[PDB]
Design a protein around this ligand. Structure first.
Ligand SMILES: COc1ccc(N2CCN(C)CC2)cc1Nc1ncc2c(n1)-c1c(c(C(N)=O)nn1C)CC2
Ligand SMILES: COc1ccc(N2CCN(C)CC2)cc1Nc1ncc2c(n1)-c1c(c(C(N)=O)nn1C)CC2
Ligand SMILES: [Zn+2]
Ligand SMILES: [Zn+2]
Lengths: 290, 290
């Protein structure tokens, strides 16, 4: 039923529906191109048949509200939204090189200078989110998207929440995040630190080549998270291992804040490439001097 | 792809696939009749394409293991299982009058003598489960099935667990039960009392005409459960209200045990019909003297 050609009344714009990208929760994403300027975008498309209950509607509406007000080099740009009688359409910045998840499935453990590259941009985008009082709450490999230059763009605000006043503890999270912080599981009240915890797990995954708390049962995984039950393999450099630990702590007060992170010895005393080549999508880069 | 005719090698038996009954988790259920004796059954059918990961397989296998060893008037009888290359087939006692859920959607609040009728048989089946060291963990309206005589049959052992030694606390529940006990949410360790809590909520629903902890967000609901945040409308007889409360308590040590329940004043000092007519599926029964 999804129409071949997405029409916005009000802006007059038409978009040809194109290549399927990926799917998740209520949504499906396609490559879409503006029929006029020919400019290309990603279209997030939610069927209204799945948004019959007000609570689901309010989630969709919250996603757009939060995403709508955000512009930054390392967050998937918002270029508009509109609806017809059957679907909601969200027009986003296309990231032609998919996400970190697909990079991770191909390359496993990344070289240390790569992790610094990506981690930095992840932190940068998240620094922007936090100073604008936004909590992502689902940072994971598949939500961190890569444009043609391999620049990271934080995406998917479907679990995001706006902090409303100082010291606010959000007490519910309605969704199931991948790298979910211990204080969400125990329902102890949560805020910005959930994102640092997640960047903890992303750092672990990028360097180690697998998630820190994987088992065959989500609930066993959850048990592990609560009891800080992980371990870093011995080959990981102590400085890296040390940043991972700082971030992966049970007590949210004790983790660095998003602004403390780029100042960490992991970044300041290691090499951080200015840019990565396309080869590095499939070949471990050596970073040779010539 | 589900075959029209289910063949067990080993027992030689064939079953014609018939009317669709309902669906849930990995399974679909149909009316099936033995091609030979013509006897009629319910067939629970799980596609192997959904059981690729060992963890899902072990759940299916656990369901059959637990259900297999159970025979009682008020638990859906197990009549066998078998598989081909694409499906698992479980052959169960057909309950022609669906479940309490469909009764509840039609009649809302039940008359007090009806609730006693149903609650008693629910408790009886569960008394059998508990003395055989089985915990259902998902007792709800849609799992309590009615045969042609309106007799209750506890069904769906997909979240059931065998208690293995005295004082064992099960620490994970991998599934999302409807009327989930507070000590499962807080991950405090859980055992048999989870079922009494559930019968608490079933009693509430049968008498009040809606669930005790309903909101528009499952997580808000969860918050309510943990904080014992419910209330009984004022028209509910104090003796009933009193049994509901005894069972709906945050502290699992403090709830009656399944064996304490039929001894409760709610049952012993009220009228309990020996049987209910089919009319009572759609008409409130007055229980007139002639
Ligand atoms: C060629 O362009 C792409 C190809 C593959 C992928 N995926 C990345 C994540 N993955 C799990 C599936 C593939 C992404 C892009 N580009 C791409 N560009 C922009 C967006 C998306 N994908 C996208 C969005 C979401 C969301 N949850 O809001 N899901 N996808 C898929 C954010 C907007
Ligand atoms: C005519 O026979 C029936 C018609 C409707 C229903 N349903 C009751 C629950 N509901 C939510 C859907 C309809 C049930 C029956 N009879 C019926 N009889 C026996 C069984 C089932 N249904 C059945 C089983 C399960 C399970 N989870 O293991 N799901 N269903 C559906 C247990 C075996
Ligand atoms: Zn599990
Ligand atoms: Zn919700």
């Amino acid at each position: 039923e999804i129409p071949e050609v997405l029409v916005d009344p009000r802006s007059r714009r038409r978009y040809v529906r194109g290549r399927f990208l990926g799917k998740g929760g209520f949504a499906k994403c396609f490559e879409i191109s503006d029929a006029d300027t020919k400019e290309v975008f990603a279209g997030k498309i939610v069927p209204k048949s799945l948004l019959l209950k007000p609570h689901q509607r309010e989630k969709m509406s919250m996603e757009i509200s939060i995403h709508r007000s955000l512009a930054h080099q390392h967050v998937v740009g918002f270029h508009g939204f509109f609806e017809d009688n059957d679907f909601v359409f969200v027009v986003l910045e296309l990231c032609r090189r998919r996400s970190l998840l697909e990079l991770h499935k191909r390359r496993k453990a990344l070289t240390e200078p790569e992790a610094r590259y990506y981690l930095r941009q992840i932190v940068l985008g998240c620094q922007y989110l936090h100073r604008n009082r936004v909590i992502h709450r689902d940072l994971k490999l598949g939500n961190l998207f890569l444009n043609e230059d391999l620049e990271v763009k934080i995406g998917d605000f479907g679990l995001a929440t706006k902090v409303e006043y100082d010291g606010e503890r959000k007490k519910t999270l309605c969704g199931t995040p991948n790298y979910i912080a211990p204080e969400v599981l125990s329902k102890k009240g949560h805020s910005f630190e959930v994102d640092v915890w997640s960047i903890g797990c992303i750092m672990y995954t990028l360097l180690v080549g697998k998630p820190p708390f994987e088992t065959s049962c989500l609930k066993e995984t959850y048990l592990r998270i609560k009891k800080n039950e992980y371990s870093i393999p011995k080959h990981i450099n102590p400085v890296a291992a040390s940043l991972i630990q700082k971030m992966l702590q049970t007590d949210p007060t004790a983790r660095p804040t998003i602004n403390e992170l780029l100042n960490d010895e992991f970044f300041t005393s290691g090499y951080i490439p200015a840019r990565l080549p396309i080869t590095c999508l499939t070949i471990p880069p050596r970073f040779s001097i010539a």
